[model samples]
Target: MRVFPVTLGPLQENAYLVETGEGPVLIDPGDEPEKLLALFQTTGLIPLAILLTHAHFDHVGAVAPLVEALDLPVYLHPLDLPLYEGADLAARAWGLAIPKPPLPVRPLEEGMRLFGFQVLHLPGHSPGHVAFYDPEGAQVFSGDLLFRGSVGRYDLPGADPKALFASLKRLLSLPPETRVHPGHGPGTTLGLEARTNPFL
Candidate 1:
């Protein structure tokens, strides 16, 4: 399995292309439809599924377009459905106009397997937020969870600081060598954050 990172959108959300047996899976197809389309065209990756770590607009800005284009299966936790479907309202506060996504959606639950990933429901930044773990690779696609030196903001519309703390503890329980690929920043290893991150 090969993982490629593409940072796009106004907030620079990280959309990852993960190669799976079915095809390449898109994790967080944020904004920049043209750029993402171009990459897929260039790589000739036939996408089979799209996994959203959460439902924030920044992380799903391009979901409508991509799903329309690929007809792929969309997955997210049911708890974030409010945030996901109400993305337009959330974006309006920032003067951003967004298209409502189409669904026949699937729920992302703990212990579920996607291609080769193990789903982990790690809520905090958003109630239904989750992370995908590739245990074989010793890495995680942690959206809005633990960052390099800090953690995700727990003051958002649906955030809970207590839940965030508990989720952080859960993530910290992983092996120290696990690499974390976050939603908005450079990647880091659990070991590095454990020793250097003051918040940990």
Candidate 2:
């Protein structure tokens, strides 16, 4: 397994291209479509699917264009479907510009397998925010759920503080050595976050 991070857009969100024997899967392709395409070409891997942790404009800006180019399907939790389609509205509420929405191919559910990754519904930052855990690799694609030294904010629309705390507690149960690749900032181990993250 190989993971490539591409930081893009005004918000500088981290978009990851995960390569496996089956094919490559993209998580949160940020605003710059051209750069993402270039990276895909450079890696010589075709995208099998696009996985979205949640539907925020900054995080999903490049989804439509990239999916159109690769004819790839998108997978996201059903709870976020409204936000995915109404990103423009969500952005407006936050006083930010909105990006166009992409057609979602499938709704993610816990225990569902995408290629080889297991879907973990870790909602907090958003109603349906999710994380992808690869047990075999000891890695987790932790969207906005857990950051380096801080966890995701619960101030956004649809965010719930109690839910965030609950989710974090559940995440803590994972093996401490699990590598957490978050939506923004530097990656950290689950153990490091459990012990050091102030919010945790």
Candidate 3:
């Protein structure tokens, strides 16, 4: 699997394009559709599905358009429905114009596999946040679960610090060297973060 992270929109959120045998898997289609579409054109990748880590506005700004273009299934944990449903409100609160979101076709769950990816249900940043783990590739697409030296914010609506701390323990239990491909900011290895992250 080849993962490409594109920093998009005003929030600078990450949207990843992962190359798979079936086709490319889009993880989060944040705003700036033109850039993402341009990236798809440049890569010449036929997308198989859109895998959402959560339903936060910035992470899902372009979900509807991409789903319309590809007609691919969207995978999301059902627990995020509340936040997903409230995306527009959050966007308005931020003074942004996010498109209407498309409903998820497949629910993401732990131990589930699709196109060679392992679903890791690590919630905290949002009630239904999840990560994609590729054991064969030794990488974890850790949405907002964990960042470089700090983890995701728990002050956001529906966010829970206690749950986040519990999830952090589970994240640390992964192979210390697993590559952490987060939803924002620079990437880091589980080893590096396990040792250095102040939160963990």
Candidate 4:
């Protein structure tokens, strides 16, 4: 599996272009459509789908333009429907502006296989948050679930500390060698995080 990460927006969210035998897929297309479009152009690889880990504004900021330009399908968990619809309002509160994105055409269910990844429905950051885990590759595209030395915030709307901790427990159960590609910041391994992550 080959994972290409592009950081965007003021939040510096990480969007990924991941390919593993199957065609590449765009994960969490945050902001700056032009940069992302240019990236796709350079690679000469059209993505098969836009897979959102959650419905936060920063994570889906470029969804509208990207879908319009690439005409690609989008997948998101059904539980985040409210957040998806209210994203514009959420961004406005942060003094940011993000156009309302298209509705998710497909739902992400636990264990479902798409683009060679096993969907893991790990909520808490947002009600419908999810992670894309590649068993064969020993890697996980963990949206806002687990960061390097801390975990995702549980104070946002639809967020629950209990649920978030429960989800974290599941992720830590993976092989220690599993590479964790988070939605923000530099990547880290499960082993490294497990040993030193303050919140864990």
* Number of the predicted model whose TM-score against the real structure is largest: 4
- Those runs of model 3 whose alpha carbons end farther than 4 Å from true positions after fitting are none
Q: How many collisions per candidate?
A: 0, 0, 0, 0
lDDT (10s digit) by residue, model 1, range 54-135: 9998888888988887787899999999998888778878998767766768989999998788899988899999999988
Quote the positional error of residue 55 for candidate 2 in Å: 0.9
Instruction: Note each model's CA RMSD in angstroms.
Output: 1.1, 1.5, 1.1, 1.0
Clashes of 1: 0
Compose the digit string of candidate 3's lDDT tens values, residues 63-150.
8888888797888899988888778789999899988787756888988998778888887898889888887788899898989888
Candidate 1: list runs displaced more than 4 Å: none
RMSD of 1: 1.1
Per-candidate TM-score against the hidden true structure: 0.96, 0.94, 0.96, 0.97
Worst 10 residues of 3 by lDDT: 99-108
lDDT of 1: 0.87
Write candidate 4's Cα lDDT for 1-200 as tens digits.
77789999999999998876889999999899988998888877678899989988889899999888778899999998788888888989999998888865688898999989999999989989999999899999999999988899898889988899999999999999999999999999999999999998
lDDT over C-alpha atoms for residue 161 of model 4: 89
